[PDB]
Amino acid sequence: YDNREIVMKYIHYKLSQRGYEWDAGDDSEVVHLTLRQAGDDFSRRYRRDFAEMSSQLHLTPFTARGRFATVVEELFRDGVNWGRIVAFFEFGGVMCVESVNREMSPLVDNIALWMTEYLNRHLHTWIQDNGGWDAFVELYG
C-alpha cells in the first residue's frame, strides 16, 4: 500500500466532490473505495462536528500546521482506532476545503504532505500491527 497514493486519491475525491480543484491531485483500488465510502459515512453521522470544524478553523499560511497538529493530537489523545483514522482523513479534507475558501490553495499541497507523513511515521506501526489496510478493508469494505 502506498500512503502518498492513498492521501492523494482521497483528497482529490473530496475536493472534486465539492467543486474544488487541486492541480497536483489530478489523475489497491479497494482501499481507496473503502476509505472514501467510510469517510462519506462518517461525515453524515458527525455532520454537526464537520460543520463546526469547517466554520472555526480560520486558517492562515503561518498557522495551518499548528491547527493541523492541534486537532490531530486531540483526535488521537485516547488512542488510535480505525474510526479515528477515518476522522483524520475527513479532517484533512476539511482543512483542504477551508484553505481554498481562504484563498490559500497552495496549502492543499502542504496538508497532503502532512497527512502522508503522519501515516508514514506516526500511525505506521499501529496500522501495520493491527492488520494494515487489508484489515480495514475486511472490516469496513
Ligand SMILES: CC1(C)CCC(CN2CCN(c3ccc(C(=O)NS(=O)(=O)c4ccc(NCC5CCOCC5)c([N+](=O)[O-])c4)c(Oc4cnc5[nH]ccc5c4)c3)CC2)=C(c2ccc(Cl)cc2)C1
Ligand atoms: C477536536 C476533535 C477531535 C473533536 C471531536 C471531533 C469529532 N469526533 C471525532 C471522533 N469520532 C469518532 C471516532 C471513532 C468512531 C468509531 O466508531 N470508531 S471504530 O469503532 O473504530 C469504527 C466504527 C465504524 C466504522 N465504520 C462504519 C461503516 C458503516 C458502513 O459504511 C462504511 C463504514 C469505522 N471505520 O473506520 O470505518 C470505525 C466514531 O464513530 C464512527 C461511526 N461511523 C463511522 N463511519 C465511518 C467511520 C465511523 C466512525 C466516531 C466522533 C467525531 C473532531 C472532528 C471534527 C471534524 C472532522 Cl471532519 C473530524 C474530526 C475533532
